[PDB]
Amino acid sequence: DLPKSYDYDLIIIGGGSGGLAAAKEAAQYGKKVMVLDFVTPTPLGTRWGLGGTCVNVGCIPKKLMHQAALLGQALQDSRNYGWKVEETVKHDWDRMIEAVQNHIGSLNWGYRVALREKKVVYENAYGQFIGPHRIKATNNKGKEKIYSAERFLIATGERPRYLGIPGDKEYCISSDDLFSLPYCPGKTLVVGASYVALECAGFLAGIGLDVTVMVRSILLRGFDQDMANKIGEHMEEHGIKFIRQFVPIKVEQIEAGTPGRLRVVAQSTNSEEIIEGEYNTVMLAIGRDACTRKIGLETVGVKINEKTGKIPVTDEEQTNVPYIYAIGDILEDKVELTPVAIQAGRLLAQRLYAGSTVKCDYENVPTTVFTPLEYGACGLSEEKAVEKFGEENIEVYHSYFWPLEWTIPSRDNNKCYAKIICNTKDNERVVGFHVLGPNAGEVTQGFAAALKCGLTKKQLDSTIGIHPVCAEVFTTLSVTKRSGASILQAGSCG
Amino acid sequence: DLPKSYDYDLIIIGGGSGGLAAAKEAAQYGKKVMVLDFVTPTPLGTRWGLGGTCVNVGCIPKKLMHQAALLGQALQDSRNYGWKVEETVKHDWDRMIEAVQNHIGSLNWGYRVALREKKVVYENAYGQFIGPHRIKATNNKGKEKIYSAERFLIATGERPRYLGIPGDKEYCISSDDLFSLPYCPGKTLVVGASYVALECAGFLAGIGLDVTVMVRSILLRGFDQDMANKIGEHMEEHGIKFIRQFVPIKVEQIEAGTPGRLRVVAQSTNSEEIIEGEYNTVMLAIGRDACTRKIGLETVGVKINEKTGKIPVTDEEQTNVPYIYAIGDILEDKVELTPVAIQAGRLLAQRLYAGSTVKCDYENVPTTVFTPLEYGACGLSEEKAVEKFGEENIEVYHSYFWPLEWTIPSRDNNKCYAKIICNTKDNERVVGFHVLGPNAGEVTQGFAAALKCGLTKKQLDSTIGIHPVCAEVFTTLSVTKRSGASILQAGSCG
Amino acid sequence: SVKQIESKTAFQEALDAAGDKLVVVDFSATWCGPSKMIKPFFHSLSEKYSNVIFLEVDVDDCQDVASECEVKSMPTFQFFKKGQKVGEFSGANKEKLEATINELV
Amino acid sequence: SVKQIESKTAFQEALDAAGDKLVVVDFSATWCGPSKMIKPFFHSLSEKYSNVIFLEVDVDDCQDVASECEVKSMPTFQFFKKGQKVGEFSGANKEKLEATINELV
Ligand SMILES: Cc1cc2nc3c(=O)[nH]c(=O)nc-3n(C[C@H](O)[C@H](O)[C@H](O)COP(=O)(O)OP(=O)(O)OC[C@H]3O[C@@H](n4cnc5c(N)ncnc54)[C@H](O)[C@@H]3O)c2cc1C
Ligand SMILES: Cc1cc2nc3c(=O)[nH]c(=O)nc-3n(C[C@H](O)[C@H](O)[C@H](O)COP(=O)(O)OP(=O)(O)OC[C@H]3O[C@@H](n4cnc5c(N)ncnc54)[C@H](O)[C@@H]3O)c2cc1C
């Protein structure tokens, strides 16, 4: 029944953010580990190397393109500071893609080298459970092979979801394809309102492209809605076109190309009205599906949520089956972020092979949406705070701010916004933190640590700010939303 | 001897950071306030408007010029991201000064509008006590006037200190003059090693100028020395030349001009050796002196430290005289930063006219030195931590980091450095925080709030980082200095 | 031509010297973009409307006047009649300017 | 000319078919700057030394040959004699490369 001897102590299915982190920690304690990583191609054939979503088609390339967008604005801002910069500088899509892919390649290599360093076995193959403690692995040439292990870790992540409409898979691209696109997207239609959709629409526009975003309902579901609308408002104010209450029903190719010409037919979400537009590229950013249905979980008994595809686990990432754990995006009701998958993996390895009892803490995980105007957040959103403690026990301190760096270029005053959510009950705890401005992520990190320590308005106000820095706006918040007082800042002429 | 009625509830001497903040809070509670603000000219006649040092010749213009330097680097970084910018872009000094002053003017106007808004009387004149509750005020035309008040607030700040050597006052400029300099400084010699000296030397070089820094002994005395040397080391690697253990003994004009040619004669700190160099501009950044000796404190009995010129106060900013308070840079053994002066002033007004008992907290005030490579810090420096708790009870976790934004331009890996100082005794308290990298101030703010909450290594490690952001490096620190392990990360190609 | 009044005493001296005639005051700042943009038109309008008195108060030079008049942003145009504020508006809108002059002249 | 070996078998086949002749292998990556900077000289050098066998191994295409030759960085050059490693160093230093080839011929 069971293999006299297990080939490995731990076999990890998925060489992404959590898997690779997990692998190294375990090895660190002399355990025999093997990471199975394979990237099934996108419908158009795109594929990439070791590292996972974030490394290849997520965080990394997206922030790099976002920086490219930021640098475009820097070129402009510079003229005003005295740099004799040309009024209009053209951007080169291919050069960018090249540089972006070149960096991803150094990362792909860094991981192969780090695994070999920790004596971890790396097999470029698709894993699929076959029986208790046994797994099959198929490579590029279809060569199967069976392996056994004392323990297994499922860290397969997810992949872009499609609309299931005529022409989406043959003419539309997803984030999986965008980051290595062989040609400039041209006039683009982004379908979706998730952070991927907005971040992507933002940098594409940032580099000079004609961008439009088709939204089904609300923007950034799951995020504080006032912030979301301020984000959308800023995106629209800056050229990004929006089409609300519409969802494509069919995509058609007018003329193939690089880019080509595509016709998009979409119906209203509350009527029968149909509209059509012509675009060069159509990106679908409507969500991702867990990769938990084609890995033989049935042959091993691990139960998952059949509807959502997520995997239910204990507070130690253990599935219903004793020797099988799971981490990363596929987990149920957790935080689908890279740093999260890494913490979980590292801690799992320490609990299992280092005698640690520390669990990953999924509470108040900070985040940052890298839209044109960045948005950092940690804790409860405003609406979510009233629900949990009651509208009358929630004080919201807020204020606008104007980055000093933006005064000479004389732009966007009364755009950057800051707000904290406080719980009047007993000590005005800072249960929520939200910031809209430059380097939002750099601004939010420290505060996430502060919320971890139970920061109160009193302690916040006692903290002295750093001048002249954007973040200091949080040390002197005095105007509540409840008072209804105004929070506008003085402009260039006052 | 004492008026039958005071013309005001409070008269503030000095319309700077603390004074103006103080004024508005007091007024907010219907008190009758008058702010006296006058800017005695620099030796070369430079003068400016309402707002104080930070607004006119400090934080604001300096960060703006620093940004100008940063944008120069951005022009370079943008090429690799696909922006077709020319190889070498020239920078115009006069355009920059113009934009900088224009913003300062909006600020000068901004403060005058704000005071009136609060019905606070403003009098552009030099205030000086003459007797109990009485002060004289002289304007630009020498028109004196006497005023009485129930209370007074000294918030006069300081001004650049000179060497007291032949030719410094007639040929050398100070920060007071730099920010509105009528012409490009050209080849420059910065004398000093304070943060003003380094920040100024850094942006001047950042914009293409030939820069040299003459230092008496060590850099950034008062700051963590390992960080200081890393800063100097970085400045050196980036053009800025340093001349150590030398101090100017005489400056002579070779030829007047805009700019002219000056000859500097400096002597060794450890010998009679003498060296001379030729420069266009010579800036002295060697410290500042309190403006507390020409305001008639004797005629009112307020005692100050005769040597340093600082004013000793209670933990509520009250001098030895009951109705006279003092705040800002002039206080003895406090923190010489703008946000500090503002907190102190605002709280003072609240304690005095709002029944508050909250005192300004001068403990663990964060700071940021805006050198080419920014440095943010909060808490004890390393050396200072060993002294306070003992070398054996201090664990220093550190690591290098490489901003993602720098990977494509392929520059400066193993430059940005992060470190925390932990107090083993009890629960590894984070008593010190230090960061060298981009947006250091945005990174340090939240963490200052965290130290305010008593952050421990355990809580820090439990906090999840934001990826991909520089600040996240602090959530995964594991390598101590004590272990002697490497933290030197490898390059792109491994 | 425009009167570059440069004195808090001069401003009241200007208004009182105006009489019944409408006085147009251009409160400007050399550091305000829109204020500099409209300045040339304010002066071209003073060469067109001779019947009206045109004054220009640089808020930096006369921190008094500007402050006393409750001025917030630049540009700000005030109209005085018999030394009494009888018209006011902020903004670098020349149409609104010329139009406000006729309204009060 | 340079032979782009694309397999562990093509590799062992190149090592054996070289006999006693020196064989220089350039371990490279299309995404590695220094690798790209040195590529030209390596290829041009192959033409200069017809007495030597120049092989190029792309670490992404021949992942096993790279791990089997234990490569951690690019550019990395390994030299062999009769199928055994006699030379090796990392870095895009052409002088050192051409000098190492001359020392092993
Ligand atoms: C466009 C985009 C932008 C993002 N930006 C950010 C950001 O700024 N910050 C952030 O924190 N997060 C970001 N994320 C999310 C982040 O990428 C994920 O949270 C993270 O990658 C999840 O880690 P993981 O280990 O669960 O899975 P993944 O990193 O997705 O890795 C799973 C790996 O397993 C492989 N695999 C799948 N099935 C099998 C199988 N059967 N056998 C073998 N291998 C298999 C996959 O091909 C892949 O390599 C972004 C995501 C996207 C799509
Ligand atoms: C080059 C430079 C760069 C700096 N950069 C930073 C930075 O990045 N961050 C930071 O936090 N701090 C910075 N500082 C310091 C900061 O500017 C001061 O800490 C802050 O301005 C102190 O506030 P204050 O109220 O004590 O005095 P000040 O703001 O200096 O104001 C004093 C005011 O009172 C006036 N005055 C003096 N005597 C009289 C009198 N007798 N009658 C009437 N008025 C009088 C003065 O002329 C002045 O207007 C910098 C300073 C310099 C010189």
Helix (H, G, I), strand (E, B) or coil at A185: coil
d(CA A300, CA C59): 80
Helix (H) or strand (E) segment spanning residue A137? strand A134-138
Q: Which residues of C touch A410 (CB under 8 A)?
A: 33
Q: Shortest Cα distance from C74 to chain B (angstroms)?
A: 10
State the maximum Cα–Cα separation within chain D, in Å, rounded to a whole number.
33
d(CA A362, CA A382): 19
Q: Would an 8 Å CB–CB cutoff place D67 in contact with chain A?
A: yes
Residue type, C16: D
- Substitution site in A59, A128, A129, A144 for ligand 1 pocket (most atoms within 8 Å of beta carbon): A59
d(CA B203, CA A36): 50
Quote the radius of gyration of chain C (alpha carbons, Å): 12
- Identify which ligand lies nearest to the alpha carbon of A344: 1
Q: Shortest Cα distance from D72 to chain B (angstroms)?
A: 6
Contact C33 A492 (CB under 8 A): yes
d(CA A38, CA A111): 14
Sequence-ordered list of residues with C-beta below 8 angstroms from that of B256, at least 6 positions apart, any chain: none
Indicate the pairing of strand A121-123 with strand A33-36. parallel
Instruction: Return the DSSP state at C79.
Output: E
Phi/psi for A138 (5° steps) reads -115, 130
Alpha-carbon distances of A302 from A20, A295, A312, A332, rounded to whole Å: 22, 11, 9, 14
Residue A319 · residue A303 · CB < 8 Å: yes
Considering the domain B364-478, what is its CATH architecture?
2-Layer Sandwich (3.30)
Q: Which residues of B touch C63 (CB under 8 A)?
A: 112, 124
How many CA atoms within 13 Å lie on the side-chain side of B90?
6
Sequence-ordered list of residues with C-beta below 8 angstroms from that of B97, at least 6 positions apart, any chain: B179, B180, B181, B182
Residue B161 · residue B175 · CB < 8 Å: no
Residue B89 · residue B136 · CB < 8 Å: no
Alpha-carbon distances of B292 from B33, B39, B157, B254, B335, rounded to whole Å: 21, 14, 8, 36, 17
Residue type, C25: V
> Length of chain A, please?
494
Residue type, A352: L
Sequence-ordered list of residues with C-beta below 8 angstroms from that of B30, at least 6 positions apart, any chain: none
Other beta carbons within 10 angstroms of residue A28's beta carbon come to 16
d(CA A133, CA A5): 11
Ligand 2 within 6 A of B52 CB? yes
Supply A122's token pair.
């790396």
Other beta carbons within 10 angstroms of residue D85's beta carbon come to 12
d(CA A389, CA A428): 12
Supply A307's token pair.
């509807």
In terms of Cα–Cα distance, which of B313, B294, B289 is closest to B13? Answer: B294
User: In terms of C-beta density within 10 A (0-12 exposed, 13-18 middle, 19 or more buried), how is residue A297 classed?
Assistant: buried
Sequence-ordered list of residues with C-beta below 8 angstroms from that of B81, at least 6 positions apart, any chain: A64, A67, A68, A71, A95, A96, A99, B408, B409
d(CA A244, CA A221): 14
Helix (H) or strand (E) segment spanning residue A96? helix A93-117
Indicate the pairing of strand B241-244 with strand B211-215. parallel
Alpha-carbon distances of A78 from A75, B96, B187, rounded to whole Å: 5, 10, 23
Residue C55: CATH number of its domain? 3.40.30.10
State the maximum Cα–Cα separation within chain C, in Å, rounded to a whole number.
33
SS3 of chain B: CCCCCCCEEEEEECCCHHHHHHHHHHHHCCCCEEEECCCCCCCCCCCCCCCCHHHHHCHHHHHHHHHHHHHHHHHHHHHHCCECCCCCCCECHHHHHHHHHHHHHHHHHHHHHHHHHCCCEEECCEEEEEECCEEEEECCCCCCCEEEEEEEEECCCEEECCCCCCCHHHHCECHHHHCCCCCCCCCEEEECCCHHHHHHHHHHHHCCCCEEEEECCCCCCCCCHHHHHHHHHHHHHCCCEEEECEEEEEEEEEECCCCCEEEEEEEECCCCCEEEEEECEEEECCCEEECCCCCCCCCCCCCCCCCCCCECCCCCCECCCCCEEECHHHECCCCCCHHHHHHHHHHHHHHHHCCCCCCCCCCCCCEEECCCCCEEEEECCHHHHHHHHCHHHEEEEEEEECCHHHHCCCCCCCCEEEEEEEECCCCCEEEEEEEECCCHHHHHHHHHHHHHCCCEHHHHHHCCCCCCCHHHHHHHCCCECCCCCCCCCCCCCC
Active-site residue list of A: 467
Residue A422 · residue A357 · CB < 8 Å: no
d(CA A399, CA A396): 10
B6-160+287-363 against B364-478: fold identical = no
Cα(C103) to centroid of ligand 2, in Å? 47
Q: Which residues of C touch B101 (CB under 8 A)?
A: 31
**DSSP-assigned letters across all residues of chain D:** -EEE--SHHHHHHHHHTTTTS-EEEEEE-TT-HHHHHHHHHHHHHHHH-TTSEEEEEETTTSHHHHHHTT--SSSEEEEEETTEEEEEEES--HHHHHHHHHHH-
Instruction: Assess whether the previous peptide bond of A259 is cis (omega < 30° from 0).
Output: yes
Residue B231 · residue B219 · CB < 8 Å: yes
Alpha-carbon distances of A110 from A105, A142, A295, B117, B389, rounded to whole Å: 8, 27, 27, 60, 40
Instruction: Return the DSSP state at A378.
Output: E
Q: Which residues of B touch C31 (CB under 8 A)?
A: 101-106, 109
Cα(B155) to centroid of ligand 2, in Å? 9
Residue type, B133: H
Q: What angle do CA A478, A481, A483 make, to 5 degrees?
A: 75
Helix (H, G, I), strand (E, B) or coil at A261: strand
d(CA A279, CA A253): 10
Indicate the pairing of strand A288-290 with strand A281-284. unpaired
SS3 content of chain A, % helix, strand, coil (to 5): 30, 25, 45
d(CA A429, CA A389): 11
Supply C3's token pair.
């009167």
Other beta carbons within 10 angstroms of residue C52's beta carbon come to 18
Supply D75's token pair.
């550019």
User: In terms of C-beta density within 10 A (0-12 exposed, 13-18 middle, 19 or more buried), how is residue A82 classed?
Assistant: buried
d(CA D77, CA D100): 10
- Substitution site in B39, B40, B53, B331 for ligand 2 pocket (most atoms within 8 Å of beta carbon): B53
Residue type, A380: L
Contact C59 B109 (CB under 8 A): yes
d(CA A251, CA A167): 5
**D62, β-bridge pairs:** none
Chain B: residue whose CA lies nearest to D30: B493
Supply A475's token pair.
């040390």
Residue B315 · residue B351 · CB < 8 Å: no
Q: Would an 8 Å CB–CB cutoff place B449 in contact with chain A?
A: yes
Q: Is B170 annotated as a binding residue?
A: no
**What crossing angle do the helices spanning B17-28 and B338-353 adopt, rounded to 10°?**
30
Q: Binding site residues of A for NADP(+), as ranges?
A: 161, 193-199, 216-217, 221-223, 287-288, 310, 336
B neighbours by CB contacts (3+ pairs under 8 Å)? A, C, D
Quote the radius of gyration of chain B (alpha carbons, Å): 24
> Length of chain B, please?
494
Other beta carbons within 10 angstroms of residue A419's beta carbon come to 24
d(CA B226, CA B234): 12
In terms of Cα–Cα distance, which of B390, B454, B379 is closest to B419? Answer: B379
Instruction: Assess whether the previous peptide bond of B468 is cis (omega < 30° from 0).
Output: yes
Instruction: Return the DSSP state at A219.
Output: S
Alpha-carbon dihedral B374, B379, B383, B387, rounded to 10 degrees: 170
Residue A262 · residue A280 · CB < 8 Å: yes
d(CA B307, CA C57): 46
Sequence-ordered list of residues with C-beta below 8 angstroms from that of B483, at least 6 positions apart, any chain: none
Helix (H, G, I), strand (E, B) or coil at A288: strand
Q: Would an 8 Å CB–CB cutoff place A471 in contact with chain B?
A: yes
d(CA B162, CA A345): 59
**DSSP-assigned letters across all residues of A230-257:** HHHHHHHHTT-EEEESEEEEEEEEEE--
Considering the domain A6-160+287-363, what is its CATH architecture?
3-Layer(bba) Sandwich (3.50)
Residue type, B334: K
Q: Cα B182 to the chain's mean position, in Å?
A: 23
> Length of chain D, please?
105
Q: Measured between CB atoms, which of A207, A408, A472 is closest to B64?
A: A408
What is the separation, in whole angstroms, between the first and last Cα of chain C?
A: 17
Instruction: Return the DSSP state at A474.
Output: G
Instruction: Return the DSSP state at A386.
Output: H
Supply B21's token pair.
């903040």
Active-site residue list of B: 467
Q: Would an 8 Å CB–CB cutoff place A67 in contact with chain B?
A: yes
Indicate the pairing of strand A416-423 with strand A429-436. antiparallel
In terms of Cα–Cα distance, which of B154, B133, B136 is closest to B144? Answer: B136
In terms of Cα–Cα distance, which of C70, C56, C62 is closest to C27? Answer: C56
Total structural domains within chain C: 1
In terms of Cα–Cα distance, which of B173, B130, B140, B224 is closest to B417? Answer: B224
Q: Would an 8 Å CB–CB cutoff place A447 in contact with chain B?
A: yes
Helix (H, G, I), strand (E, B) or coil at A127: strand
Q: What are the b/e assignments for A188-206, b being 16+ CB within 10 Å? A: bbbbbbbbbbbbbbbbbbb
Helix (H, G, I), strand (E, B) or coil at A67: helix
Phi-psi group of B426: left, alpha or beta (phi > 0 → left; psi -120 to 50 → alpha; rest → beta):
left
**Has domain A161-286 been given CATH number 3.50.50.60?**
yes
Range of the domain at D40: 1-105
Helix (H, G, I), strand (E, B) or coil at C76: strand
Residue type, A378: C
**What crossing angle do the helices spanning A382-389 and A225-237 adopt, rounded to 10°?**
170
Residue C23 · residue C15 · CB < 8 Å: yes
Domain ranges of chain A: 6-160+287-363, 161-286, 364-478
Indicate the pairing of strand C23-28 with strand C76-80. antiparallel
Phi-psi group of B264: left, alpha or beta (phi > 0 → left; psi -120 to 50 → alpha; rest → beta):
beta
Nearest residue (CA) to ligand 1, atom 49 = A52
Alpha-carbon dihedral A124, A127, A130, A136, rounded to 10 degrees: -10
Instruction: Return the DSSP state at A318.
Output: B
Alpha-carbon distances of C89 from A490, C27, C73, rounded to whole Å: 18, 11, 10
What is the separation, in whole angstroms, between the first and last Cα of chain D?
A: 17
Instruction: Return the DSSP state at A308.
Output: T
Phi/psi for A465 (5° steps) reads -85, 165
Residue D19 · residue D82 · CB < 8 Å: yes
Enumerate the H helices of A118-206 as residue ranges. Answer: 168-171, 175-178, 195-206
**DSSP-assigned letters across all residues of A394-440:** EEEEEEEE--GGGTTTT--TTTEEEEEEEETTTT-EEEEEEEESTTH
Alpha-carbon distances of A390 from A61, A434, A458, rounded to whole Å: 41, 19, 21
What is the separation, in whole angstroms, between the first and last Cα of chain A?
A: 80
d(CA A38, CA A61): 20
d(CA A403, CA A406): 5
> Length of chain C, please?
105
Residue A172 · residue A283 · CB < 8 Å: yes
d(CA B456, CA C103): 70
Q: Would an 8 Å CB–CB cutoff place C59 in contact with chain A?
A: no
Residue A153 · residue A13 · CB < 8 Å: yes
Alpha-carbon distances of B240 from A77, B87, B190, B232, C102, rounded to whole Å: 25, 21, 10, 9, 62
Sequence-ordered list of residues with C-beta below 8 angstroms from that of B298, at least 6 positions apart, any chain: none
Phi/psi for A145 (5° steps) reads -165, 140
Residue A197 · residue A207 · CB < 8 Å: no
Nearest residue (CA) to ligand 2, atom 3 = B58
Q: Would an 8 Å CB–CB cutoff place C67 in contact with chain B?
A: yes
Instruction: Assess whether the previous peptide bond of B339 is cis (omega < 30° from 0).
Output: no
Chain A: residue whose CA lies nearest to C35: A493
